[model samples]
Target: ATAGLAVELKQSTAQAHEKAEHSTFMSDLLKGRLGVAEFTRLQEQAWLFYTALEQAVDAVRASGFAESLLDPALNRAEVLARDLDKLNGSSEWRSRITASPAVIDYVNRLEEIRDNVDGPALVAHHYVRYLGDLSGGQVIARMMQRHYGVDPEALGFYHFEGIAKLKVYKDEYREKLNNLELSDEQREHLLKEATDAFVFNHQVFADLGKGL
Candidate 1:
């Protein structure tokens, strides 16, 4: 049997993941060179991105496609908004920041998925964002807390309240992802989209770096 889609996705996107992590803004942030203002900007961009992603998932949820991945615990829209509000010290913080061009393009891509109700592609984006948060996100959260003095509540983006064990949850997530029936073309598109997620993020990071 061929490798599972989850395995293929990891293989295909490894390089892109590396590139994204090494992006100037991400590297700076991880290394503690960037401060809370920059961190707030990244969260603001993430809010826009995750909102678009959640909307796309909502469009496809009724179709019974990608059902295994649609756990409410994975939803970041509400948590991201809360984090942004706390970071900005106001519930009206949406008006305080704007989306970067890369985030706009990323959101535009999600809109296409939404209009087409493309569940597999939506899963690709979901895997990139949520899985990253579940895995490396803990490290990033600690770094932010230690370096930027971010309050724990404001780092809600990294806290999956619905999940008990991150490792088991991640394993089950991948297992469920692999359980989905996909044609070769669909699988290829999903892999491509996963890579595209990293590409979009890298561009967003670069855009953030420009303002820094």
Candidate 2:
């Protein structure tokens, strides 16, 4: 509880996945019961998400508020496309895919924030996503490879070459977030947005988990 912005934020969402973690989709996913195509279907959802997020980062930066939030290595769209290629058995798969109904709703939520063009809103998203990719997201990556027999580097979206030292980098990113020049109202908005980001994410997972 004494932890500042980053720690508080991290702790806040720690339980976001508790219910979803036990979900049948994730249970089968970890147990290697789901086939490659089905897992790749999940990856497709992630691709739609990062695609929208990266686009929002661009607009957020242009609006002059996301400088502290920018990290070139965290750009995940290209890696997502590559991973999708790795799974789809084609180097040109991005052109041939369409968003699932769940994925479209997820992307549309992100697109709303992009349309808002508020830099801090992206900070909330950037925190929820990239940090998760760098943290617990790593566990999922490990399970996918060790149990599910995924190919090397195919899950590059979760691997952070941008982070040579993850702990130090994570700390620094949090410091930047906490130290940002935000008003009382802005900070509150950021917190709410961060919470909303997870709800949005969990909803997508729940939706995807259906019929699995």
Candidate 3:
């Protein structure tokens, strides 16, 4: 069961990385359209969301589920963070945005959120599997288009090029899960975990939107 959970968690982690990439992509596009001040403001908002997710995941970890799940998740987050920096640094559009006091303050706020969250371990264990579903992306895309007037071109980062190919990925993932040979009870537990993860994510997003 634990092994199955691990595989599911990894799948979710990959999806989260994709989401983070999408956020960065949107920031880049917005930078081109809105200039540095607005772009930085949006980036600050995104950073807060990302920092909150990291904190939420950490909070789940306190539950005593295998730390093995965290190993890959954290590694992926670090890699994504590096990618984010690269995107920010390389963008000519971003370069024009002056780092004014407000911008600095926004960045500082995100940094504080990242630094201060305790990341309850129990929450991490429950939420990772729920993140595996890519359905939320479609919903989020619509919301972005409606609320922010984002065009498909600007929102391409949120678009998953490989979702049509998701069957293959799901098969591979299930194969890994099957290989784990979890007992029936364990399988049921993992399913519950997945459900719990989804609920946690919904709550997180709801809370985050409120903050925004």
Structural similarity to truth (TM-score) of each candidate:
0.96, 0.88, 0.37
Q: The CA-based lDDT of model 3 is what?
A: 0.42
> Candidate 1, 152: how far from true, in Å?
0.5
User: Per-model C-alpha lDDT, please?
Assistant: 0.90, 0.78, 0.42
Residues forming the 10-long window of minimal summed lDDT in candidate 1: 91-100
Which ranges in model 3 have alpha carbons more than 4 Å from their true place? 1-164
As a TM-score, model 2 comes out at 0.88
Count the clashes in each prediction: 0, 0, 13
Shift of residue 184 alpha carbon in model 1, Å: 0.9
Q: What lDDT is reached at residue 183 by model 2?
A: 75
Which candidate's lDDT is highest? Answer: 1
Q: Which TM-score value belongs to model 1?
A: 0.96
Q: Clashes in model 2: which pairs?
A: none
Q: Write the per-residue lDDT of candidate 1 for residues 1-212, one digit (tens) a residue.
A: 27888888899999999999999788889889989999998998889899999999888887888776888678888998999889988888777667888998999999999999998799899999988999899999999999999999999999998788889999999899889888888888899999999999999999999963
Deviation in angstroms for 190 in model 2?
1.4
Candidate 2 regions exceeding 4 Å error are 1-3, 14-17
lDDT of 3 by residue, 1-212 (tens): 24565465556455544454355435443335334333334433444344445554554445433333333323223333333454455544334433334334433433443354322222233244223433344564565566556554443434544346555645644454445444566555555544444443344333333323
1-212 per-residue lDDT for model 2 (tens digits): 36667776766766764654576676788788887777787887888888998898888888878586687778998888888888998866677667766667767867887898877678888898887787777888888888878986788878887578888887788888777787777767877788878777767666667742
